[PDB]
Amino acid sequence: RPPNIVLIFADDLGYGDLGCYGHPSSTTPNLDQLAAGGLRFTDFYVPVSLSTPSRAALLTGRLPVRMGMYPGVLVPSSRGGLPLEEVTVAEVLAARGYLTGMAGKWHLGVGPEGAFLPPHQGFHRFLGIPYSHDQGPCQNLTCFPPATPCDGGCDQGLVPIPLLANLSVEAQPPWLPGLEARYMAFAHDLMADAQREDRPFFLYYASHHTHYPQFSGQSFAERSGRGPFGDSLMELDAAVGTLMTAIGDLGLLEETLVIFTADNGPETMRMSRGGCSGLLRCGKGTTYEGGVREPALAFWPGHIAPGVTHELASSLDLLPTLAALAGAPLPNVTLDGFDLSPLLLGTGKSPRQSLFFYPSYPDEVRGVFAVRTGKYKAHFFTQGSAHSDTTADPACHASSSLTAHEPPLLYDLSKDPGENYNLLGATPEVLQALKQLQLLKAQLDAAVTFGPSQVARGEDPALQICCHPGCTPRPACCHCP
Amino acid sequence: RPPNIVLIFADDLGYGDLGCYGHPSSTTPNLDQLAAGGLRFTDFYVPVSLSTPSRAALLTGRLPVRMGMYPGVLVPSSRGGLPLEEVTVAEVLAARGYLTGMAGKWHLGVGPEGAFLPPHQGFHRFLGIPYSHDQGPCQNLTCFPPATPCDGGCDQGLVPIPLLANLSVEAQPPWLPGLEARYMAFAHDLMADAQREDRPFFLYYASHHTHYPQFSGQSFAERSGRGPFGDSLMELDAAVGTLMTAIGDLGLLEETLVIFTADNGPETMRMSRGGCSGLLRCGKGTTYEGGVREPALAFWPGHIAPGVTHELASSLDLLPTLAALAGAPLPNVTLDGFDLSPLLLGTGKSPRQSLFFYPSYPDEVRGVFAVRTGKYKAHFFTQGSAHSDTTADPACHASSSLTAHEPPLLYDLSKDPGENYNLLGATPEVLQALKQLQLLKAQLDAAVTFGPSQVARGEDPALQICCHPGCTPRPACCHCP
Ligand SMILES: *[C@H]1O[C@H](CO)[C@@H](O[C@H]2O[C@H](CO)[C@@H](O)[C@H](O)[C@H]2NC(C)=O)[C@H](O)[C@H]1NC(C)=O
Ligand SMILES: *[C@H]1O[C@H](CO)[C@@H](O[C@H]2O[C@H](CO)[C@@H](O)[C@H](O)[C@H]2NC(C)=O)[C@H](O)[C@H]1NC(C)=O
Ligand SMILES: [Mg+2]
Ligand SMILES: [Mg+2]
């Protein structure tokens, strides 16, 4: 029987942040235990370094330009959304009779009467926030109890952040120091109800950690020894421990696949309240390894043996691997990932040879920015980003504008994961890798047509969720805490 | 009974190079296994980022300026050396009847008739090279068999690199692809002879890995997937596995303490043939965390439980911890380290609160460059270094000259291990940390007097070891391969 699947997706968490990936001061003991008894990926990626596009690619297994999830991210007034025609993972498992649930951040659009919310995209249950938790004013929110306010205020002129239950506003805004319990409790109930109906569950846990502003419940506040980013990562980690215990308590260890990853690199613009890309260069917002190479853990006792692969994998491969593993069939669409079960089960290698990376602002004349094949990565274009400012590497800053590279900047990621030493700027291994990387970009660029942008369809403030429909004056009247 | 102690010391190996410290492509499975069953330090340091000074501080537990081991490092023609009056670790254990042995790099001086070599400083046995393996021409040496030459040539106009056995030249130069077996074999014989005389051994294994030029025996050549730096680190790692097996085979697991660390940060000047400081800044040659924060593993089954401490420790603390653990008494000199056995055995905390860092070129008007207390590190002076050139961080380059900082640059290493965000440039926690850091530098600077420099005592080419004493023309006639 198809296994129970729990998929945890962190926010803005970098390759250097878990203790098991090197950080000297993070406290993440549950995730360190998953790694110890599971497969830890050294080379897993997402294809775009922002929340919306990355969340689209994970849920559909498709490159976000194919369905319009560019440029940038969706906002609360956004008209647009992940089109209802896309088939998400949830649709695929639900059809094979999984009881499917989602807690936490959606960021795939809201729309006219909530048309784009999770309940329309295959989730049976949903408790969470429809976009990112800083997309609403937070100067008066508490981030750390008893009364430590969130820092900097978040986005102004907006409705406060709403917690939803299917399409209804449960709270607005919610109490950040208690979000976690709400989500643990929703998770526990979905497990148990699934067990009791004799059915596999799919839990999609999109945490708010470790996105700005940082918050945690009172057990973690000031307990990690890495300040607010730490406390917030310790809570995420504790949360994981909790789901693992609940998996315990219902006798489901050997019957559940648990995967952890994160949507994109760290926001170093938040300085020491933001993540760490460890040795990789830059972060969120860029196509350097720091923004697109994420941590990734796969645990299934008695199916996946403890270890470390260096094989290539993407968040784009998760739909196809989970369909395979649950005996569900694939949507009838072009998919950009592959099944990795041979790699997970130890019977094979990853089928993936190449990875393609688009910028925050893609366009059809430039096409893909970077391509990785085997050990080699070519950058055809480079660009820094405000989400990665403040570090000492100047190629990460927003003042490093869009620069073309012809011939591309060429790195051997197995000896230079750091992306410091351009091999062109000329061996037969190299030149052969160069002609391949050039042919693969020209091939994808001639074959992908960009789906018309959802984000450019505009904003309308009337689309903001409001607790007290009709009230006045908007947006501040919208609120039922 | 005092335990058998094996102390492994790598060369130019950074905080980001072991697989267990985060590297995505290194292959170090034996050391990853030590960490898994031992205590892994996140915050262990050396006090000076070069080979000579660091090797002096480990062996005596004293700050290298106290006995003249500055500026820079010793060369083959050097007149000077670690003074014979210093009491090394080897002296301390030998006196309590350890059979003491050393394999690999000395770099503590040679001198007129080998007066400063290991056999005069407490080692019963010694097989190794009296300085660094690139300090002699290597354009004709093989680094990777069957016939891959060492890269770049090393130092010219010198006698070739000599392999010594006590004070005799065994080979000149030696066959780099076979150094490891020679050293494994010497280690095995010291174990066994110690077992058979009913006595504890002390093995001091100073590896040549991962110093330039890189080399390995034919089992590792081209096998790691990180190129020559990898192959060379895989061999070091395999070597460790071997000593662990020999510890197995003579029934000595529970009776031996094995420690691994490294003398100083990575030489990023060798680009992708050099190490990785992971998230820390810069490398070898500097007083940034990248040059002085090393990996460190302590393993003793049934004495030290598996885990991770964040407590402060230094290479300066090893003499005193090993004396304590062997019931030997301490030299009657000022020591700058502490016993850490409570921390190793789980009964206590590190006594160390503060760490002091000197530059490659110290001087008495400037005094210590940086000071760490608790979580805070102050830099009073900063300076880049040619050994750390070629990265994107400009503070590491040799073009970043000696700059004073008053008030000092102040970092909170628990949230900013990266040393990116200066907290001055002003909370009560901060200001209190600032007055302490200032008082501790002024205190050490008024109390340490610099021992007269050994390195300035000059060079004399007649002090170069020569296989064929008297031959002509020197240096090329010196050679018996
Ligand atoms: C809102 O919608 C879902 C789906 O109806 C609610 O669904 C569940 O509610 C009860 C148990 O949780 C039962 O009445 C229904 O069996 C159940 N439906 C399914 C398909 O499981 C759910 O409670 C709400 N979502 C959440 C948890 O917020
Ligand atoms: C050179 O010096 C040491 C010390 O004499 C040699 O010592 C050992 O040699 C034999 C066994 O290894 C025995 O003859 C002696 O017991 C022994 N001495 C001690 C104190 O162990 C040694 O072989 C040489 N050093 C090496 C290994 O190069
Ligand atoms: Mg994000
Ligand atoms: Mg060195």
Swiss-Prot record, chains A, B:
Inhibited by phosphate. The phosphate forms a covalent bond with the active site 3-oxoalanine. It catalyses: an N-acyl-1-beta-D-(3-O-sulfo)-galactosyl-sphing-4-enine + H2O = a beta-D-galactosyl-(1<->1')-N-acylsphing-4-enine + sulfate + H(+). Changing T268P: In MLD; adult type. It comes from Homo sapiens. Changing Y358N: In MLD; enzyme activity reduced to 4.7% of wild-type enzyme. Changing H379Y: In MLD; adult-onset. Keywords: Calcium, Disease variant, Disulfide bond, Endoplasmic reticulum, Glycoprotein, Hydrolase, Ichthyosis, Leukodystrophy, Lipid metabolism, Lysosome, Metachromatic leukodystrophy, Metal-binding, Signal. This is Arylsulfatase A. Changing D11N: In MLD; infantile-onset; causes a severe reduction of enzyme activity. It comes from the Eukaryota. The keyword Lipid metabolism applies. The conversion to 3-oxoalanine (also known as C-formylglycine, FGly), of a serine or cysteine residue in prokaryotes and of a cysteine residue in eukaryotes, is critical for catalytic activity. This post-translational modification is severely defective in multiple sulfatase deficiency (MSD). Changing L34P: In MLD; loss of enzymatic activity. Its EC number is 3.1.6.8. Changing L163Q: In MLD; infantile form. Changing P118S: In MLD; late-infantile form. Changing Y411S: In MLD; adult-onset. Changing G307S: In MLD; juvenile-onset. Changing H209Y: In MLD; late-infantile form.
